[PDB]
Amino acid sequence: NKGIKQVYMSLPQGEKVQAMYIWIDGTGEGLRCKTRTLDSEPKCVEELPEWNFDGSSTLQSEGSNSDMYLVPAAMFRDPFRKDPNKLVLCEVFKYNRRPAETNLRHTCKRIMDMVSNQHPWFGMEQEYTLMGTDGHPFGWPSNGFPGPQGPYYCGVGADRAYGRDIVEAHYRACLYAGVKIAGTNAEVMPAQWEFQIGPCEGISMGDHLWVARFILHRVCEDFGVIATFDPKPIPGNWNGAGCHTNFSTKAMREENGLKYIEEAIEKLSKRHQYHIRAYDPKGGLDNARRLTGFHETSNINDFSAGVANRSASIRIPRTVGQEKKGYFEDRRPSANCDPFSVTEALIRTCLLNET
Amino acid sequence: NKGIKQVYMSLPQGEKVQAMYIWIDGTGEGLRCKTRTLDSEPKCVEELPEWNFDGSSTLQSEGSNSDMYLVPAAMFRDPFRKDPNKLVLCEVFKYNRRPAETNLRHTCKRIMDMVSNQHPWFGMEQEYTLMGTDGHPFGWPSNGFPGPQGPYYCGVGADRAYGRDIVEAHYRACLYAGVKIAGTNAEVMPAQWEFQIGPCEGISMGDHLWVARFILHRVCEDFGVIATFDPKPIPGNWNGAGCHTNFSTKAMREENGLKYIEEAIEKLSKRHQYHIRAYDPKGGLDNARRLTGFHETSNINDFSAGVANRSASIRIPRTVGQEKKGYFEDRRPSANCDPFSVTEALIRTCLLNETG
Amino acid sequence: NKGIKQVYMSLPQGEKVQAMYIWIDGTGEGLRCKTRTLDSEPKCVEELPEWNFDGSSTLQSEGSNSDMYLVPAAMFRDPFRKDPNKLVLCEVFKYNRRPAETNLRHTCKRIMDMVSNQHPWFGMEQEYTLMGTDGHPFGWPSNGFPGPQGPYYCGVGADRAYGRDIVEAHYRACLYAGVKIAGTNAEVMPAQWEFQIGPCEGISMGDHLWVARFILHRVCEDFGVIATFDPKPIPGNWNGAGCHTNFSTKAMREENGLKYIEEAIEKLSKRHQYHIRAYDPKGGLDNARRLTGFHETSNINDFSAGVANRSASIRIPRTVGQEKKGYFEDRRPSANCDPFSVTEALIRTCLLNETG
Amino acid sequence: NKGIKQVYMSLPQGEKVQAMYIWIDGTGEGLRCKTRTLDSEPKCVEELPEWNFDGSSTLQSEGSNSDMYLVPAAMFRDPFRKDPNKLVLCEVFKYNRRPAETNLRHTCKRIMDMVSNQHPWFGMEQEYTLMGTDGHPFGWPSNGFPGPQGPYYCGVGADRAYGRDIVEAHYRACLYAGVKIAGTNAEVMPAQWEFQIGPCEGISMGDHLWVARFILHRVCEDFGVIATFDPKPIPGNWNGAGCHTNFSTKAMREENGLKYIEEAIEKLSKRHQYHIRAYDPKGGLDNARRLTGFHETSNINDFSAGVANRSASIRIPRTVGQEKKGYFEDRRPSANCDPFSVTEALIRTCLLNETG
Amino acid sequence: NKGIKQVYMSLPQGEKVQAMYIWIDGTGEGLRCKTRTLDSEPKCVEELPEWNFDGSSTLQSEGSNSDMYLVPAAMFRDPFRKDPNKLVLCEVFKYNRRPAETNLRHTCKRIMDMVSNQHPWFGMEQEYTLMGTDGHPFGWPSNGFPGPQGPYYCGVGADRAYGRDIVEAHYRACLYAGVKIAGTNAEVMPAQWEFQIGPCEGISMGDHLWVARFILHRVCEDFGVIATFDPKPIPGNWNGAGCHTNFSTKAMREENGLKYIEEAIEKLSKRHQYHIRAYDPKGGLDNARRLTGFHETSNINDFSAGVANRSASIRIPRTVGQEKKGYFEDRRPSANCDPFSVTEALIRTCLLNETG
């Protein structure tokens, strides 16, 4: 019970600091973490030491040659334990010092360093659904369905906003951590929510979202509920869950940048399948259950773009159409995507001209 | 659980500021909201940026041309997240920049801006009933009725004031927000309560009332209950819910302003139907279940006025009668009325002298 | 849930001030209340404005001429909302500015003003029983009885003090309110408790007791329990509940004031029925269930007085007999008496020498 | 659990027989019983032996001289244990062989023998409410009220007929027992029911009703509920419980017997209080909570008769009016009356022509 | 509990017989009943005596002239009490021996007798929904909805057939009663079922349906559920409840009866509104919530005929088309219709050739 825990957490900690290292596991979806005591507060991520873990217990190596490296990547303030304690998102490397199969950050970071003069900015909309520990969505009638979609999107009242406590707590944990949380909203399916992260330049998009995600799970853990990023948690007449990625370069944000937005969309229109394969951890099999062309989605087989069009693969927000500068929104990525794969694909297709 | 939450909400938030944008959806009764992060604290409503939402998810636009505009109208302090965070009432406009069908603030503002030298003040009494999530009123016997009306009005005791925690929390949240809450009371039906908002000049009446209604639903949300503004939530020998609108111009508040009170009433007497059509979101259908001439209502079909008379369409409070100045009370609006429609009707009829 | 509420109640409220107006309804026993926002903290009760309420919803007037006046009488600090908020006990008057039928303060006050040189002080022992919301006393076995009386009077232990949280909370609320709470004790019946208010001079007795009673009902409301002031809430072999009124004048408090105590008691002995009628709201029919001559009561039909005698109509406490000065205790008033009625009878009989 | 019991009750019993002796206790309303084993089946009430009991445990005598007599009066078949076992209604006599204070049958029987040539028949409508173990009517919302009266009289459906199982079981028990049960209906108040016993000649009315009542309390015991015969078990806007006594003599049953019916009513009109005193066990005090003139009752203070009039003290049913023969309905008796008292009074007033 | 009851119901009852009289109340939809003991088993309905009831406790007369007549119309065996016990359906008459406002049988019998030579047969399909005591359909998630319609029509399994015990019990009860039950099926909405009663000549259609309805409510009572005949019990994407009245005359059943089926469908096309007013007890307002044109209904405002067309007002079943004889199906009657009013309209329009 969390009133007991809180008494303990009030105890002055002293000169020692806790650092919780976080990594992506052998599934490409699951996050793992563990804590060490440091002698003093690190002033930045470069002062954090390297560490390691049992790769055989995360599906990433064999028991008899099991140590796998953790190398600090991004440091944040720990909103579960307060200052001076830290969260550290790490990269994983194998016994031979090569990146792990699910270390998609390594290549992504290199790609972003190469296009830094164009200052690529990303804003990702992590939709997700709150679930009871029993597998059924939070607040839903037991063995049953609430009333049809309509009243839950941005809704207020015990009869339609299910789980706001998580959202509020997460929002505040992120602000404390230093994660660039841009906003939040209740979504179309009851118990389904959203937070936006951005705009983040370069590799920091992936960094900030993954830590954002870790904070969601730890937060939910405290409330005794589960966050799912599955793109279609409830089959049938219920909305799925995406991770719309908004994107802009410097040129796109300048006066008449819409020219370049349109060039970018044109390029994406030729590399649809490649992006579908980049946009969920099962190469597109997961989005196959969301991207149906209903429930505010595009069909998985058909590329389209349009102004203010929540049925298109890419939407140009009304604002951006009017102002003729800004960003476009790629609506194809699954809620369970790896932002390093999503953001890397966008750079390769839009800035590096791969085909 | 709420204790877990409070721990997170004790964390210092830093330099960034949260702004919750609030609007009226396609039903004209539901409120919607969402939050953006800003780089610093806005010093007034004019410093808040425009925004937009998916109008196809609120019954206001089509999926494939869905964005709709949010334009800040009224800013308040957020009593759920504390300073420096904000609540922002917005007006909704369509893809073509025109007011949404349920944007009744737009016209109403213009009408208030035109009669501002007469400083119209309004006081609205929002009644509402607290409901369990099972659709049965809060504190009522499961599947059953509490004892007859009599002891609940302005009552005190666990056996008669059902839900005061909400009432107390909402009163304090409003005060902190900057909402001009004038008072509150337990009401005749058990689980039913009231807050008064006013006196508010002009367009601020609708602004304050709508934000007050938002705060109530959010407060109720924390307590795992629902507030309903339905004008007759329980049929039979149980009181309905109204939104009595108290109204005065500068002339009515001066010595012998009763003269002008009587004139406003005389004009209201000829435009009863038009007011009934303006007094709920279904043009009088919701009020048909309440305005019966019983349970301290007037009959929907009959206009009447009277001093201290809780059965008339209009009541002149005893105070006003004695002092020969003040305001009159229009007792016809439904609990679920849109105050912009209500206040605008009163201006058109009483100040702009419209007929038909 | 009360943890949620406390978060809202920690919000700084700002410049505006809440004033909870409190009055006695048409039953002469029920308390009612409602709140208004004021622009600044009032510093005397007189700075509070008159108000009014619907008398048709408290059984005191008709709906079609309904407003009834609230005139502030006594002001206290609000222990539910904190400084700068206020509780205000009021007098009720009719449409014609005459006192309500259940406004017994009006005459009482005038009677105290006639004898102010004699400085009458009162001390009232409010006994009450804590009840579950199901009508069964708090802590009692479900559908049954605890063990017999003996161990509960002034008792300590989870198995004998039922409901101390309420008592401790109310003690502190009154101290903060500025109500002159003299003490408290667990009583003979389990779930039954007592608080003493005094000594209060003149009209303040009734003011303080009524506010104490209001504060008790509000406190119980928080704990999800009911206080009953019924004089015999459980029939049979269980103590009833009275409101022992201790009384003295200047003369009685001075050296050898026992002479005047005894003179007062002789006047009381000739006016027993008149007092009984004044000592509950049903003119003696409620006390007929308590004043049995058992369970530390006198029989309703006989007058008797004695030193240290918990069976007499009047008791002279041992201390007072010994010091030959102080006060006497009238043990006849019902727990649900109206203190304005009790204190006034005492003055008329003992100081104004009335007969009738 | 009744399945366990039912297996034991399938065991064939053997040659021995069980007789449960039943009597009225010191309260005049409470029924007592105990069982003895007999060598063989009695073929009538006269082959049953006298017995006794502890009067000091039924409020009827002193511990130290306590045995009181039981003399068989009416024998019936036992529907709880089946043939060949028996229920026996007894008269109670004191140590000195005189009738007990609550043995009203002894005087009744004589009065019936004084007029047996006119063959008095009676039918009584025992109304009663089923209550939970918790003191609250069966099927009612916990701590609350079902919907208003209207749908429950002769109702069918889970949401309006509460406790038919009891009614059905009892009906069948009485028939088996040999009680002259005439019919049943659900009543106006939810969980309130009725059975009619009749028509019974003379003393057998009281005999049959008391045994009917015993069978009812027994049946209820199996189902874990209580029957109350209180005349007003829920105060306010709910029907109370009566025991309408329908009455006729041979003259009244013959052609143009209405002549004599109206004579009978004229005599009763002059002895109203006398009958109210005979019509509940507290000589009228219980009926003062029921006979209000509302809820299909007469006013306790007023005598009246009318054809088909459920507000009158006496009702001549339409059937009887049309045919000009039959009987009349005394609607004054309480649900908790002693039928020996009611039946005795009617004979004294109507047939023996007493005045006083 | 029901195990206790069944023990009692195994007691052999002896020579007396229970007759439960059943009637339609002031609502036109409510069934009432009550029971009397008879000296022997009646063999024909004509043997059963007239009776009466309190019309003032059923909304059919005033307290002070309240008796209303019951005249036995149709007799059946009682499946709740078994042979030799009877269910009797009655007609209600007023104090002045005229038909009660809701006795629609009286006129219908005269119409039926006019066309006895055309031997009119009806078959009615009583659709109904099983509800919990709590107002929510049986088996539905609590506060929630089950999965979309599709798998429930004629479904099998704990996840799609909700309440078969009721259906099976009712089927068997009707067959024992003597009610002409033609079949049953689970329906499209979960918890919604169907039973067919037919084919019944003339006035015996209404008689059989109404008793069937009684038997259903009674059976549901046993199980602690409610049956509703509301035509649209759950709003939205859920089927409503009809009472499809199939119909033929002797000409229509003979070879090439389709000729006369079509002539009758033609006469019905010109009296749509008349029939809509005849087809629910609120003159069409209830059917307004069901006859939308969706959920296998026709639009209330539109007449249509069609072979195998479940969207049509009238459906000619494939069978009847292929064989050019039989009957046609009026799909317009609400689940809560009075069969006497439905079947009367059909004879009037089709056989008596009425207009306007």
Ligand SMILES: Nc1ncnc2c1ncn2[C@@H]1O[C@H](COP(=O)(O)OP(=O)(O)O)[C@@H](O)[C@H]1O
């Ligand atoms: N110039 C930009 N480049 C990339 N992302 C941007 C830019 N400007 C805003 N964003 C981001 O786009 C996201 C907008 O998402 P959201 O507000 O959820 O819009 P919608 O629901 O209309 O898709 C936010 O993360 C925001 O920070």
Ligand SMILES: Nc1ncnc2c1ncn2[C@@H]1O[C@H](COP(=O)(O)OP(=O)(O)O)[C@@H](O)[C@H]1O
């Ligand atoms: N001059 C005025 N003009 C308009 N409204 C006023 C004026 N004076 C007071 N009011 C408002 O009228 C309302 C009175 O409502 P309430 O106190 O509930 O009255 P009631 O006696 O009708 O229940 C309050 O909102 C109050 O602020």
Ligand SMILES: Nc1ncnc2c1ncn2[C@@H]1O[C@H](COP(=O)(O)OP(=O)(O)O)[C@@H](O)[C@H]1O
């Ligand atoms: N001079 C006085 N006049 C009136 N009341 C007094 C005086 N002195 C003390 N009292 C009051 O009498 C009451 C004593 O109550 P309590 O201690 O319960 O007495 P007991 O149980 O001994 O009757 C207290 O309110 C106390 O303040």
Ligand SMILES: Nc1ncnc2c1ncn2[C@@H]1O[C@H](COP(=O)(O)OP(=O)(O)O)[C@@H](O)[C@H]1O
């Ligand atoms: N001639 C009669 N003399 C006495 N009682 C009769 C006579 N005829 C019928 N009764 C009885 O009167 C009672 C009728 O009560 P009930 O059927 O409940 O009528 P209601 O409710 O209309 O007053 C039954 O007990 C019946 O046996």
Ligand SMILES: Nc1ncnc2c1ncn2[C@@H]1O[C@H](COP(=O)(O)OP(=O)(O)O)[C@@H](O)[C@H]1O
């Ligand atoms: N010639 C007829 N006249 C009247 N009713 C008939 C005739 N033949 C069959 N029926 C009845 O019509 C009804 C058919 O209903 P049902 O089997 O539910 O039809 P549906 O195909 O509409 O589901 C049954 O009551 C059946 O007995």
Ligand SMILES: C[S@](=O)(CC[C@H](N)C(=O)O)=NP(=O)(O)O
């Ligand atoms: C309301 S929605 O259009 C819903 C998107 C849907 N869940 C999906 O992308 O699958 N997203 P948004 O308005 O945040 O851009």
Ligand SMILES: C[S@](=O)(CC[C@H](N)C(=O)O)=NP(=O)(O)O
């Ligand atoms: C107590 S009441 O008369 C009740 C009004 C009722 N609820 C209605 O207007 O329907 N309102 P108020 O006294 O606040 O003016």
Ligand SMILES: C[S@](=O)(CC[C@H](N)C(=O)O)=NP(=O)(O)O
């Ligand atoms: C313990 S008692 O004697 C009990 C008094 C009793 N309840 C009555 O006055 O009815 N009163 P006190 O408070 O004076 O000690």
Ligand SMILES: C[S@](=O)(CC[C@H](N)C(=O)O)=NP(=O)(O)O
């Ligand atoms: C329906 S009632 O009028 C109810 C009478 C009420 N319970 C009474 O107290 O008398 N009795 P009845 O129909 O048996 O004559």
Ligand SMILES: C[S@](=O)(CC[C@H](N)C(=O)O)=NP(=O)(O)O
């Ligand atoms: C399955 S249904 O078409 C459904 C009928 C719908 N409930 C109605 O309102 O008629 N009736 P039928 O048993 O004739 O097939």
Ligand SMILES: [Cl-]
């Ligand atoms: Cl850890």
Ligand SMILES: [Cl-]
């Ligand atoms: Cl939000």
Ligand SMILES: [Cl-]
């Ligand atoms: Cl208040």
Ligand SMILES: [Cl-]
């Ligand atoms: Cl026994």
Ligand SMILES: [Cl-]
């Ligand atoms: Cl019955």
Ligand SMILES: [Mn+2]
């Ligand atoms: Mn979004």
